[PDB]
């Protein structure tokens, strides 16, 4: 009504309870069913739903669970499909709700058509920011934070990234042709490694139609880069190993897309196979279509380790293997959850470093370190608190869903204690603000 | 200009309807017929509605015989259950009459909106009484404060008599003089600012209203008052500066910052308002600045936010115990607003926040407390009252810290 808005400048909110909001979404579904006998009307009525939710998390979650129930009860009815449609639109508009994504939404196809999202501008900012890998080492560590933050966002909220796959395709199209020596001095191969890790995380939701087209473009860029360094391909053995791991997963989930991509561009692949005889894996791939047993003495020594010398030596050994083989740290997670609470300084610092490396490789397991991390924050040993505060922004960025309580605890120990966590807490706040809102 | 611009042609639709709807002897709807329809004790809102809905087709000249019957009866319209259609139509007729007989209409409409405490309730205000003191317009009935058409009438009369007083005092000053200029200007400025303050207090929700904000008569009244204050501030920004130096309830700040587009000029005197020795002027400056920053995120807005954080961190070490509590309880919720608007303030905001937190924790440790927040060092979130001030201020510091962190993570 204009009388309510008289005088507003119109340049950059109704309260309703639970059951009324449920009746409202049922009425929107009734509208959708009456019109279907398009997504335009259901998108048109969406701002009314948001104007009645007023951004309340409780209302959003209640609507979400009611829609999940409606999808389950209605099976795969037309109205059930419309329930999925407005549920995915609601997830787009309010992704702050960190509910894990049901498979019914993964099977939904309408997410990759024309739509509106709230966080797309932020993740777009993230990937263009990470792409500018200039020479300043402070900026290089900032780019590293960007890459691992995108890793965590990929594992946590995949679908928002999946609408940013042509984004990464374009980002990699730019830098492929440039020569090898300038490739290493301007530090662009790290960006390739980062986005490779991203895409390795993003599976198997990275394997639908529009995703398939963006992947095809990205893989054309990848093989163009590979053929661009046929005379200097022998330093990137681990990168090509990650590449063929991606290839194995690709043929595993979507075999026909990989077959179509390889057969359409069979001549560059056979050219790379012939030109570089050292590529055993490529030839084998084209023709065809560790564990506790090793770590056991080390975790034995770590568990039955009382002196600082034994802990130091076994932790240095685990450190060197993890530098070779970062995947091995998941086995030791429980042991050095306890060793990073230890009173010894260097041993605790090493346990912290290895734990952070562990959960940076695997952004899912960082939540398991939460109770021991804020135990370290709350510990009466001041050195433990100091080293936890040192590692606070990295872990908070690795946690996000618990970065609220983490930084609140950091502030409380800062103010009731005498330490000043303002630098660390402010850096963490800056980074996760760039994560969340702007 | 509003009383003049309404005369302007939109299409001439009303000319067509006057031509077509007025012929079938409808002029029999005499003013006394309307008065009989009004004075009937079952009211019969259908009859009065019919009469005035015929009256809209009359030109402004022939509506003049109907002026008294629809002004004098308008106090009856304040009663509950009177449909919005009659109030809007009476508003339209009053706006039409305002174009031909404005002075007589205003004088005889002020008298029609007295609270009716007495038998006549002093139905004797004249042009001169309202010109010496336009605030009589706001001494009207309690009930028009939530009657948006009648509120619009009152605002038109108030604006008119503010200007009329401005002229009248100049005329009388010239007559008597045959210094006083400063006294005249101060009187006009104080009178205008008092009008603004009374209007802002109308916008406040009374305790009866305490018992959905957007859809209420309160919100319509707030929009009307905001439009009027916008006109006043455009006309004389010194009035805006004076009103904010006086201050008003901080509860009105989101309303008056959102609804009045000319409040970005406040950013040009927030530094002067901060410099005032009064603590309450400083607190109001911080709160007003926080709301402006959340509205206008400009480079000068950030500069004044930096100045506010600096001044708030400066007087943290100037204030005593009681003054620290008094200053930092209202100004600490402004920090989440600064952090919303300006991410580059995070380092300064949290350094200031940790400083205030350490000061308040030290103060808590000095005396025995009922709550002892220090040993609550590891409590969890308290998402959302006789405690002592120091523990209250500690909890306030924590609360703004969770609001900041929640905002940054959402």
């Amino acid at each position: 009504v204009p009388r309510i808005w008289q005088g507003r400048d119109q340049r950059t909110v109704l309260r309703v309870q639970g059951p009324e909001l449920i009746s409202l979404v049922e009425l929107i579904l009734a509208e959708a069913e009456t019109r279907s006998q398009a997504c335009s009307l259901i998108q048109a009525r969406l701002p009314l739903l948001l104007s009645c939710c007023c951004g309340d998390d409780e209302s959003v979650r209640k609507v979400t669970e009611h829609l999940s129930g409606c999808i389950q009860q209605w099976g795969d009815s037309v109205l059930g499909r419309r329930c999925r449609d407005l549920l995915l639109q609601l997830y787009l508009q309010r992704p702050e709700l960190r509910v894990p994504v049901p498979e019914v939404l993964l099977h939904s196809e309408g997410a990759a058509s024309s739509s509106v999202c709230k966080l797309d501008g932020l993740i777009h900012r993230f990937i263009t920011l990470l792409a500018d890998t200039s020479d300043s080492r402070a900026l290089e560590n900032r780019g590293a934070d960007a890459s691992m933050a995108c890793r965590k966002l990929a594992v946590a909220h995949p679908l928002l990234l999946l609408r940013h796959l042509p984004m990464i395709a374009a980002l990699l199209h730019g830098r492929t042709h440039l020569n090898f020596q300038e490739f290493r001095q301007q530090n662009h191969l790290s960006c390739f490694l980062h986005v490779l890790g991203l895409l390795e995380l993003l599976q198997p939701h990275v394997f639908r139609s529009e995703h398939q087209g963006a992947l095809w473009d990205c893989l054309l860029s990848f093989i163009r880069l590979l053929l661009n360094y046929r005379k200097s391909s022998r330093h990137l053995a681990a990168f090509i190993n990650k590449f063929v791991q991606f290839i194995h997963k690709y043929i595993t989930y979507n075999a026909p897309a990989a077959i179509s991509f390889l057969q359409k561009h069979a001549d560059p692949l056979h050219d790379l196979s012939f030109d570089n005889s050292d590529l055993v894996m490529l030839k084998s791939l084209l023709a065809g279509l560790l564990t506790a047993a090793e770590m056991a003495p080390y975790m034995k020594r770590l568990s039955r380790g009382q002196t600082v010398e034994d802990l130091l030596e076994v932790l240095s050994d685990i450190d060197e293997m993890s530098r070779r083989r970062p995947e091995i740290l998941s086995f030791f997670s429980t042991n050095l959850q306890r060793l990073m609470s230890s009173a010894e300084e260097c041993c605790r610092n090493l346990a912290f470093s290895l734990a952070l490396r562990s959960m940076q490789n695997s952004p899912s397991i960082a939540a398991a370190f939460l109770p021991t991390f804020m135990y370290c924050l709350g510990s009466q040993d001041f050195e433990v608190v100091q080293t936890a505060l040192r590692n606070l922004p990295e872990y908070a960025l690795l946690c996000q869903e618990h970065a609220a309580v983490l930084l609140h605890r950091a502030f409380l120990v800062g103010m009731y204690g005498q330490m000043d966590p303002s630098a660390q807490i402010s850096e963490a706040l800056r980074i996760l603000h760039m994560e969340a809102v702007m | 200009v509003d009383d003049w611009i309404c005369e302007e042609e939109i299409t001439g639709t009303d000319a067509l309807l006057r031509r077509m709807l007025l012929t079938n002897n409808a002029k029999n709807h005499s003013p006394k017929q309307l008065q009989e329809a009004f004075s009937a004790v079952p009211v019969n809102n259908t009859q009065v509605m019919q009469i005035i809905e015929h009256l809209t087709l009359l030109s402004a000249s022939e509506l003049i015989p109907y002026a008294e019957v629809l002004t004098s009866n308008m106090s009856q319209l304040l009663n509950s259950g009177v449909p919005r259609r009659i109030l809007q139509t009476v508003n339209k007729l009053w706006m039409v009459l305002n174009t031909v007989m404005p002075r007589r209409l205003w004088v005889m409409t002020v008298n029609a909106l007295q609270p009716s405490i007495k038998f006549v309730r002093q139905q004797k205000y004249t042009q001169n009484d309202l010109m010496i003191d336009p605030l009589i317009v706001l001494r009207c009935d309690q009930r028009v404060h939530r009657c948006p058409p009648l509120m619009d009438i009152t605002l038109h009369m108030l604006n008119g008599y503010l200007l009329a007083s401005k002229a009248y005092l100049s005329a009388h000053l010239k007559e008597t003089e045959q210094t006083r200029e400063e006294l005249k200007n101060a009187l006009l400025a104080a009178q205008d600012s008092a009008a603004v303050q009374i209007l802002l207090e109308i916008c406040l929700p009374t305790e009866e209203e305490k018992a959905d904000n957007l859809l209420c008569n309160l919100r319509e009244v707030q929009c009307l008052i905001c439009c009027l204050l916008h006109q006043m501030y455009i006309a004389d920004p010194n009035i805006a500066k004076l009103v904010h130096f006086q201050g008003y309830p901080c509860e009105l700040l989101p309303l008056t910052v959102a609804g009045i587009p000319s409040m970005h000029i406040c950013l040009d005197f927030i530094p002067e308002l901060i410099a005032q020795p009064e603590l309450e002027k400083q607190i109001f400056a911080i709160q007003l600045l926080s709301h402006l920053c959340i509205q206008y995120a400009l480079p000068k807005s950030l500069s004044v936010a930096r100045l506010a954080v600096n001044v708030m961190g400066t007087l943290l070490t100037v204030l005593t115990q009681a003054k620290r509590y008094a200053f930092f309880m209202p100004t600490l919720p402004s920090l989440v607003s600064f952090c919303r608007a300006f991410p580059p303030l995070y380092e300064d905001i949290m350094s200031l926040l940790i400083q205030i937190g350490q000061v308040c924790a030290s103060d808590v440790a000095t005396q025995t407390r009922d709550i002892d927040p220090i040993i609550t060092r590891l409590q969890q979130i308290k998402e959302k009252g006789s405690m002592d001030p120091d523990v209250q201020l500690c909890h306030c510091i924590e609360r703004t810290v969770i609001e900041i962190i929640n905002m940054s993570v959402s």
Partner: peptide, 13 residues
Amino acid sequence: SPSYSPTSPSYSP
């Protein structure tokens, strides 16, 4: 000026 928003398009004489 109170009559123009700070983000309004500036007038160049």
